[PDB]
Amino acid sequence: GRSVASSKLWMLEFSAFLEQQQDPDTYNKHLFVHIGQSSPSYSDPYLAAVDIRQIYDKFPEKKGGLKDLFERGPSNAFFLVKFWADLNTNGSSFYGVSSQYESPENMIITCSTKVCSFGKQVVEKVETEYARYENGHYSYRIHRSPLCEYMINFIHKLKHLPEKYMMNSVLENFTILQVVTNRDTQETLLCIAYVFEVSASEHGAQHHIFRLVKE
């Protein structure tokens, strides 16, 4: 499906999942959210714009926050992803997140993921990734990164809510900010703001990708 790309980095894949082990040879994987799974990943400027000012309140402020990052640019690195999450699932459980990126450049990259409540940072996960040469480009993979305990707790609490409108109500004040940076130069390669609702549709998880603009 539709993915996310600046001039220097393309995120081809992103998925958060629960993997359950029935027995040593049998595993069941449930995808909560996914980009580049059901169909081959592609990227083009054929997607709509969102005024970033409409979402500043939902993400960290001050130096290093979303406004600061956006103003520093480049403008083409900033995206808003709306997820409709599939919550229909559930000792032998593994909650994980996997992502893959491609670049023309051989870099050392840092991926910061901040989980936020009411626009305030709750937890940050920071990962450093080195390049691998692949078919005329450089590939970066964050493979089966364990979901933090806060997120596991959050998912558990969501599923224990008796009504779906309640889940959506909670989700309106839950956000994730992902910032992928060149470690040495501190250039913003990708900055992705994630917003959530619960999926109701029979096919499962869905997403829409928007460009963040100044207006």
Partner: protein, 40 residues
């Protein structure tokens, strides 16, 4: 109080009479594209 209180976040929706969280503008009331609220 603490804005990042996980229990308080869920209590706000489960037990609205005892809700103690920041007051916010719902997303559906904001200047956002139609595609934001309608899945593909």
């Amino acid at each position: 109080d603490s804005e990042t209180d996980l229990e308080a976040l869920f209590n706000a929706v489960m037990n609205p009479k005892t809700a103690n969280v920041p007051q916010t503008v719902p997303m559906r009331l904001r200047k956002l594209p139609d595609a934001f609220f309608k899945p593909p």
